[PDB]
Amino acid sequence: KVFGRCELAAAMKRHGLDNYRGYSLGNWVCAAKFESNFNTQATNRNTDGSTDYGILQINSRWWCNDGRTPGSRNLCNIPCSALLSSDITASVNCAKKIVSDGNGMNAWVAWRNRCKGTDVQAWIRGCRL
Ligand SMILES: CC(=O)N[C@@H]1[C@@H](O)[C@H](O[C@@H]2O[C@H](CO)[C@@H](O[C@@H]3O[C@H](CO)[C@@H](O)[C@H](O)[C@H]3NC(C)=O)[C@H](O)[C@H]2NC(C)=O)[C@@H](CO)O[C@H]1O
Ligand SMILES: [Cl-]
Ligand SMILES: [Cl-]
Ligand code: NA
Known part of the structure; x- marks a missing residue:
């Protein structure tokens, strides 16, 4: 599914992300835009495999x-395919664990480079929340 901007904001708010660990909703929407262009089916391969x-x-x-990242951890205890569903619950629940792990939203490279320190x-804006 490709979400609309306000559609995604409303879904993330319903799942408890607004001000989660001090990060306002706009931070999460901005991160999603630049990580995936709001597409739940996005995948990208890293150099390390x-x-x-x-x-x-x-x-x-x-x-x-x-099943193909040897010597990796499964800290959210889920198949990666679960993160591609049109229902964002699994992605949101895992993101809550990530942002609590010490580095906050700096875990998301595009947030650090394109959202952090912006408005x-x-x-x-304009969304019914
Ligand atoms: C959205 C996403 O998947 N981002 C990936 C990043 O999570 C990842 O950064 C590394 O993440 C691990 C786990 O959060 C970091 O380890 C943690 O670091 C903190 C602070 O040092 C420490 O308190 C935790 O104990 C420690 N947890 C564990 C299990 O070791 C690790 O430091 C991060 N490494 C860097 C360079 O930021 C990066 C890198 O793999 O990829 C993103 O895609
Ligand atoms: Cl905001
Ligand atoms: Cl923080
Ligand atoms: Na893994």
């Missing part, structure tokens, strides 16, 4: 099992 999955591009080296509230 791991793969990033879904709307928040969660990495198989650490967070999910795809992230603009990503939720």
